[PDB]
Amino acid sequence: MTEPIFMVGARGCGMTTVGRELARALGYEFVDTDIFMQHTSGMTVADVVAAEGWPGFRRRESEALQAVATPNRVVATGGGMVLLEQNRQFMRAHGTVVYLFAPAEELALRLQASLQAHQRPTLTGRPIAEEMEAVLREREALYQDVAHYVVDATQPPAAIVCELMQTMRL
Ligand SMILES: [Cl-]
Known part of the structure; x- marks a missing residue:
């Protein structure tokens, strides 16, 4: 029972929080592809895309995934x-994939919270909202497609780890 566990979402x-705790309960080491990318490709998307394009950003991301994915x-x-x-x-071929799910509506509400004081209706507000929800929903369908297991990540982290330990059988 030694395959890496991939967390997606x-x-x-x-x-x-869930990753580290989970690592602690299994005697595993916690790692994060985004940190790996900051360390090896720098702190900005802008520098990578300017130097190597979106395909070179994706390539560095894919290499980070493959590099940190060890037992x-x-x-x-x-x-x-x-x-x-x-x-x-x-991910599916090399280990177990857990999707930490949060509804696309909640993610949109998080973006609003961080960017706009409130929401009075405006002529352009719904259309733009609608576009952002469509993109969120397209990504959601891919989180679901890759996952072996799905856990409600709108729960506190301790409740998630426990459900995963049951769900995945540890
Ligand atoms: Cl994100």
């Missing part, structure tokens, strides 16, 4: 890791 849904590890992934099929296929 949006960031801000307790991947770090006895719980791997947190970037919110966009599931966007390319090759990453989804890699």
Whole structure:
């Protein structure tokens, strides 16, 4: 029982807290592809895309996934890791995938909270909201497609780990 465990979902849904705790209960080491990328490709998307394009950003992400995926590890992934099929296929072939689920409506509400004081209706408000929800829902369908297991990540982290330990049988 030694395969890495991949955590997928949006960031801000307790991947770090759940990941570390889970690692602690199994004697595994916790790692995070986004930190790996900051360390090896720098702190900005802008520098990588300017130098190597979106395809070179995706390549560095895919290499980070493959580099940290060794036995006895719980791997947190970037919110966009599931966007390319090759990453989804890699994850399923090399270990167990847990989706920390948060409804696309809640993610939209989190974006609003961080960016706008409230929400008075405006002519352009719903259309733009609608576009952002469509993109959130397309990504959600890919989180679901790659997952072996899905846990409600709108629960506190301790309740998630316990359900995963039951769900995955530990
Ligand atoms: Cl994200």
